[PDB]
Amino acid sequence: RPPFTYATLIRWAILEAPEKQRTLNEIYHWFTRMFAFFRNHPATWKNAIRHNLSLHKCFVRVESEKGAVWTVDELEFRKK
Amino acid sequence: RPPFTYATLIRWAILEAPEKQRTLNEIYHWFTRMFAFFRNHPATWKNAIRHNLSLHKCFVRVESEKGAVWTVDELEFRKK
DNA sequence: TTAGGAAAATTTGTTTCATAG
DNA sequence: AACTATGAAACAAATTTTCCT
Numbered sequence: 169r170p171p172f173t174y175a176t177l178i179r180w181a182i183l184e185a186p187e188k189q190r191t192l193n194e195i196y197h198w199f200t201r202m203f204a205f206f207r208n209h210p211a212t213w214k215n216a217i218r219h220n221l222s223l224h225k226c227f228v229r230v231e232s233e234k235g236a237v238w239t240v241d242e243l244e245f246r247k248k
Numbered sequence: 249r250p251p252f253t254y255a256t257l258i259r260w261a262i263l264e265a266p267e268k269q270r271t272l273n274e275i276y277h278w279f280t281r282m283f284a285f286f287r288n289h290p291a292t293w294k295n296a297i298r299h300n301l302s303l304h305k306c307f308v309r310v311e312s313e314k315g316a317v318w319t320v321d322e323l324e325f326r327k328k
Numbered sequence: 329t330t331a332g333g334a335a336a337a338t339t340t341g342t343t344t345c346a347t348a349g
Numbered sequence: 350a351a352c353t354a355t356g357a358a359a360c361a362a363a364t365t366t367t368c369c370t
Contacts, residue, residue, distance in 0.1 A: 169277065172285040174300045178307065180260070182320050189310065189317040192301065196294055197249065203293070205251040206286040214335095216359070217275060220254040222338050227258070229337080230269070236336085236367080239269040240262045248255070248357090253358065272336065336367065342360080349353075 177202075224248070257282075 181198040182190050190198070210216065221227045226244040230237060261278035262270055270278075289296070301307045306324040310317060 169281070172281050174289075174296050175304050175306075177285070178297065178300055178304075179320050179325065180264075182307075182318060189312065189319045191315065191317050192298060195297055195301075195318070199293055199297065200249055201252055202282070203286055203290060204249055205257075206283050208251065209283065210360070212360080213279065214276060215361075216254050217258060217279070218272070218335095218337065219339095219360085220258055220358095221272070221336095224255055226255065227262075235271060237269045237271050238262060238275070240259050245259060255358090332370090334367100334369080336365105338363100338365070340361100340363075342362100344357100344359085346357085347355080349355105 177199070178195065181195055182188065184198070185194075221229075221238055224244075226241050226248065228239055228241055230239055257279070258275065261275045262268065264270075264278060265274065301309075301318050306321050308319055308321050310319055
């Protein structure tokens with residue numbers, strides 16, 4: 169359960185730039201976009217994840233390793 | 249300013265794990281570690297984020313003919 | 329084994345908000 | 350100042366399938 173540090177979230181947001189760079193302000197915007205989701209989560213969100221996982225083609229269940237897992241299809245994602 | 253969608257976040261959670269794949273309940277946790285973080289620090293966020301970029305030296309400022317921007321030095325996270 | 333129930337997946341159904349005509 | 354048509358997204362929920370005792 170390693171929790172989330174500023175350090176990390178910043179890495180994650182910089183790394184979601186088209187170019188692996190972002191302006192302080194864009195970073196706010198990233199944080200803001202995310203603040204703007206976690207309070208406006210529902211009681212059932214586990215329902216919403218199960219749902220999106222089945223529904224979109226970008227998520228594909230494979231069976232390997234410890235148990236059955238979920239993986240992304242970067243291609244299918246790129247079109248949405 | 250919009251939320252990110254389930255789909256985006258979910259994609260992310262899948263990716264955090266370096267193996268680019270994770271079970272359902274491994275995702276529920278990523279989501280929690282977020283849920284948590286934002287319940288905790290919804291303070292003067294912005295301010296933190298210049299304090300870190302500067303402090304943690306895995307964050308580096310570079311010049312674009314765009315403008316002055318931040319990148320991560322991935323070779324300077326993990327450890328040294 | 330084999331149940332039996334619960335967690336995962338999957339499927340349908342409602343409703344909203346945002347776009348081009 | 351509709352009205353038409355389209356589609357993402359979120360949410361609820363209803364069934365079926367896998368997985369864990």
